[PDB]
Design a binder for this molecule. Structure first.
Ligand SMILES: Nc1ncnc2c1ncn2[C@@H]1O[C@H](COP(=O)(O)OP(=O)(O)OP(=O)(O)O)[C@@H](O)[C@H]1O
Ligand SMILES: Nc1ncnc2c1ncn2[C@@H]1O[C@H](COP(=O)(O)OP(=O)(O)OP(=O)(O)O)[C@@H](O)[C@H]1O
Ligand SMILES: Nc1ncnc2c1ncn2[C@@H]1O[C@H](COP(=O)(O)OP(=O)(O)OP(=O)(O)O)[C@@H](O)[C@H]1O
Ligand SMILES: [Mg+2]
Ligand SMILES: [Mg+2]
Ligand SMILES: [Mg+2]
Lengths: 334, 334, 334
C-alpha cells in the first residue's frame, strides 16, 4: 500500500544506537495497543525512524490483515485537516482518522507553531487512546523541547515510552552497507566497504549515496571496485576539527606573523594587533577555556585577553575594512 | 512545449568532462525512478546541465507520451509557490507539482536563504519520492557547499547520485564547434575551428558567441572565413596567468627599478622600498610558497619578507597616496 | 508609444564606425528572435545606440502589429523593480517584463552595483531567451569591463553577437549634417557643412548643437548662412598633440634657461633641476618612449632617466607648491 517495501524489520540493521527503539517498535508490532500505546521516537535525520515504523506497519498488516494501519506525515495531516475544514469535509476527516487500528506519524515537530492542527491532533490522540488503539509518533526532538506545544500534548507524549536514535558506529555502518549491497546484488571488497564507512559518517542517507556513486563510477569506468576506485570516486564529497594551533597557523598564514612573535612581550601596535585579532578569533570560535587559551598564547592572564577582544569587538562594530578582513579570515580558515 | 528542441541527447557532445553526467542522465532517462531517483548534476557555467535535463525530458516524453514531465527553475518554483500562497491556491499548487511523473528542477542554489520555500520543496521531494517519481536537480555547487540549506534537504540531496561537469578539453571544444557549425548549415575551416577553440576556454555559451561573431563579420565583409579573418573578427572579444617574473617586470616598468637592485643586499630606504612593495604584491597575488618567492627575491629569509610586508600593511592601512599607487599597480599588472 | 519617430533606419547614416552595428541591427529587425537573439551593442556617447534600438523597434512594430516590443532603460528597470517589490506587486512586474516579444533594454552598465536588480534582470533574460524572445542590450563599454557583473549575466551578454560603434569620420559627419538639414528643410551651403564637420568632431550631439547654433544665429542676423557667419556663430563654442620640444621650451622659459643648453653636459643644479622637471612632465604626460626621450635629451641612459624620474617623484611627494607650479605649466600647455 502506502508503505515502502524496502522498509521492514528483517531489512533493518540492529546496532547500539538503535537497539532500544527497534526493540520497542517490535514489541509494539507484536502487541499493538497493549505494551506501549503511545510510542514516541526521536533522533537525528537519516537515522531510521521512518524505516522503523514502516516496519511496524508491515508487521501489523502481515500478522493481521483486518487491521487498518494508516501512516502519514504531520505535513499531510495538517494539509488534509485544513482542506477538510475549507471544503466542509470535517466529518469525513474525523471518520478516516479516529477509526484507524494503528496510526503512524512522521516529524510531529511540524505541528509546532500551528494551534488548531495541534488541537485536532490532541483530540485524535485522545479518541484513539480511549478506544485502546495504537499511536506511534516520530520526531527529531524529544517532546520536552518542542516549542509552541501545549502542556496537555506534552504530557500525552511522555505518557508512554520515549525512544531515541543516535548516529551509528563503524560496525553497524559496515553492516548497513553490506545489507544494501547484498539486497542490490553486487560484490564489493571489505577494504572498499571499510573505507567508505570510515570516510563518510554523518547520517546513513549519505552512506547509501556514497556507495551508489562509487559503484556507478566503477560501472562507467568499466572496472571492478577497489579501494583506489572508492578513493577517486569519493573525492568531491570528503568535518575539519579546528585546533588552537590550526587557527594560529591560519592567522600566521593570512597575516603571516612569525611563530614566536605572539609569545613575545612586545607592546608595540604592529606586533600587538595580530595577537589580539587572533585572540578574539580563538575566543569566539574555539571551545577551549580562557585560562587555557591564555596559557598556550604566551601564558598571558585572562585580563589581557578580555580587554583585547573587547576592544576588537568595539573596533569591528563601527569599522568595515577590518570587517571584510575578518570575514575573509573566517572564509579561508574553513 | 516547455522543452527546447535543440537541447537533446543527439546534439550533446560527450567528452571527458561530461561523460559521467551524460551516463547518469541517459541511464535515468532509460529507467526513470528506478536507477537513481534523486539525481543531482552540478558544475560551472555554460556547461550543459540545462541541455542534459532537457535531453532527459525529451527522451522520457518520446519513449512514454503519457508521462507527465515538468521542467522548471527553482526561481520559477519560488515565484509560483509564493503566488499560490498569496492568491489562496496552495492546494492547486500541490496538485500541480506533487503529482508529476518526472520533475526536472534547475539551479537549486536559488533556494539558499528562502526557508519556507525550502520547506515546501522538502515536502514536495518527500511526496515525489514516496510515490516513486523521478527527481532531477541541477545546481552550481555541491549540496554541502550551498549556504542556508537545512540538513534534511542536504541529506536528501546527497541520498542519490551526484555528478559534476568540468570545462571541455580542446578536442571537445573543436567537436562542439563543428556540431554547431553543421547545425547552422555552413562550412568553417578546421584552421578557424582550432583558432577559436584554442583562443577561448571559458564556456560553450561564449564558444558559440565567438563562432557567431566570426561568421557575422565574414558575412558583413563579404569574404570567406579564414584564420586571419577570425583574428580580425575577434579583436575585441578575446586568462593571462600572473607570475612572479612578470610582477617584477611590472613593478620595474612602473617604479622602474633595475632588475638586480631587488637582489642587492643594500639597506637604504630608496633601494629597499620597491623590494618590499613588490614582495607584498606577489604575496597577495601569487600561489607560490613564501620560501620559493623569498629565494627568488635574492635568496632572502622568510622573516625579512614577513616584517617588510607587514610594515607595508601598516603603511597602507593609514596612508592614501600609496593606496592609489598600489591600486594603479594592481590595475596595470593584470 | 515609447519609441521615437525621428529614430529610424532611414534617418541613420551608415559609415565605417556603424556599418557592422547597422547590419546586425537590421538582421535582428528583419528576423526577430531567430537570427541573433542576445544582441549586444556598445560604444561611446552620442553615437547612435538608442537610435538603432528605436529603429529596430519601429521596424518590428511596423511589420508585425501583433508584436509586443518594449523599449526601456536600465534606470527605469531598476526603478520599477524596486517600486514593485516595495508595493508587494512584483507579480505584475514579472508579467509585464517576461512576456515582451522584443526587449530593448538600454545603458545596461547602470545595473553595476545593484545585486538584486542584476538578479532580477538575470531571471528576466533567462525567461525571455528560453521562450525565443528577442533581446537587445546597449552599453557604453564591452560586457567584460562592466564592474560588479556576475559571470552568469556576463556570459548571457556574450552568448550571441556583440557589436561596437566607433566615432564617425569626415564624410559621414558631412552626410549626417546634410541629412539633418534636409529633414529640417533649409538650404545650407556645403562649405558651411564642411566647416562645421571639420571643427567639431566629438559625437552627433555637439555636431547637431553646432548646426542649431549656426541656424539660430543666422536667423537672428537675418543673413544667409555662409562660412564667415558660421565661424562667427561658432566662435564661442570652439585636442592638441603634446610635443617634447614644446614642453622643453615652456619649462626652459619658466626656469630661466635658454634652449641650446638642454642637451649640454653641464651638471649644475640650476640647469639639471629644470631639466629633470621637464623630463618628468614628458614622462607623466606624453606616450613617447624612454629611448626616444633620452635621444631628445642628448643620448642620456635609461638608468639615468629612471634615477631622475624617481628623484623628482620622491621630492614632489613631500611638497605641494612644486605641484602648483607643475599644474600651472600644464594649464599653460593646455
Ligand atoms: N539499521 C539501520 N538504522 C538506520 N537506518 C537504516 C538502517 N538500515 C537501513 N537504514 C536506512 O537508513 C535510511 C534513513 O532513512 P529514513 O527514512 O529512516 O530517515 P529518518 O531519519 O527516519 O527520516 P524521516 O522520518 O524524515 O523519513 C533509510 O533509507 C533506511 O533504508
Ligand atoms: N557537451 C555539449 N555539447 C554541445 N553543446 C553543449 C555542450 N555543453 C554545453 N553546450 C551548450 O552550452 C550552451 C549553454 O549551456 P547550458 O545552458 O546548457 O548549461 P549551463 O549553463 O550549465 O546550465 P544552467 O543554465 O541550467 O545552469 C547551450 O546552448 C548548450 O547547447
Ligand atoms: N549615423 C547616424 N546618422 C544619423 N544620426 C545619427 C547617427 N549616429 C547618431 N545619430 C544621432 O544621434 C542622436 C542621439 O544619439 P543616440 O541616442 O542614438 O546615441 P547614444 O548617446 O549612444 O545613446 P544612449 O541614449 O543609449 O546613451 C539621434 O538624434 C541621431 O540623429
Ligand atoms: Mg524518508
Ligand atoms: Mg543550471
Ligand atoms: Mg546608451
Amino acid at each position: 500500500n502506502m508503505l515502502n517495501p524496502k522498509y521492514t524489520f528483517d531489512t533493518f540493521v540492529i546496532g547500539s544506537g538503535n537497539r532500544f527503539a527497534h526493540a520497542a517498535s517490535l514489541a509494539v508490532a507484536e502487541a499493538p495497543a497493549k505494551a506501549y500505546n503511545p510510542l514516541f521516537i526521536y533522533g537525528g535525520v537519516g537515522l531510521g525512524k521512518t524505516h522503523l515504523m514502516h516496519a511496524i506497519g508491515h508487521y501489523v498488516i502481515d500478522h493481521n490483515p483486518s487491521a487498518k494501519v494508516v501512516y502519514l506525515s504531520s505535513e499531510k495531516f495538517t494539509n488534509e485537516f485544513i482542506n477538510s475544514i475549507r471544503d466542509n469535509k470535517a466529518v469525513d476527516f474525523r471518520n478516516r482518522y479516529r477509526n484507524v487500528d494503528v496510526l503512524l506519524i512522521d516529524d510531529i515537530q511540524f505541528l509546532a507553531g500551528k494551534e488548531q492542527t495541534q488541537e485536532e491532533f490532541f483530540h485524535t490522540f485522545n479518541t484513539l487512546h480511549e478506544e485502546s488503539k495504537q499511536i506511534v509518533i516520530s520526531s527529531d526532538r524529544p517532546p520536552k523541547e518542542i516549542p509552541t506545544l501545549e502542556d496537555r500534548l506534552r504530557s500525552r507524549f511522555e505518557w508512554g515510552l520515549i525512544t531515541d536514535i543516535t548516529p551509528p558506529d563503524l560496525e553497524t555502518r559496515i553492516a548497513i552497507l553490506r545489507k544494501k549491497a547484498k539486497a542490490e546484488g553486487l560484490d564489493i571488497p571489505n577494504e572498499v566497504m571499510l573505507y567508505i564507512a570510515n570516510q563518510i559518517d554523518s547520517n546513513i542517507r549519505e552512506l547509501e549515496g556514497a556507495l551508489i556513486r562509487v559503484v556507478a563510477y566503477s560501472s562507467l569506468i568499466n572496472k571492478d571496485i577497489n579501494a583506489d576506485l572508492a578513493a577517486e570516486a569519493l573525492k568531491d564529497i570528503i568535518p575539519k576539527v579546528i585546533t588552537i594551533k590550526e587557527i594560529q597557523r591560519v592567522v600566521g598564514q593570512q597575516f603571516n606573523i612569525k611563530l614566536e612573535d605572539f609569545k613575545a612581550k612586545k607592546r608595540t601596535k604592529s606586533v600587538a594587533f595580530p595577537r589580539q585579532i587572533a585572540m578574539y578569533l580563538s575566543r569566539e570560535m574555539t571551545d577551549s577555556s580562557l585560562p587555557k587559551i591564555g596559557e598556550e598564547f604566551g601564558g598571558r592572564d585572562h585580563t589581557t585577553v578580555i580587554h583585547a577582544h573587547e576592544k576588537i569587538s568595539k573596533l569591528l562594530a563601527d569599522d568595515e575594512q577590518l570587517q571584510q578582513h575578518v570575514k575573509e579570515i573566517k572564509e579561508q580558515l574553513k
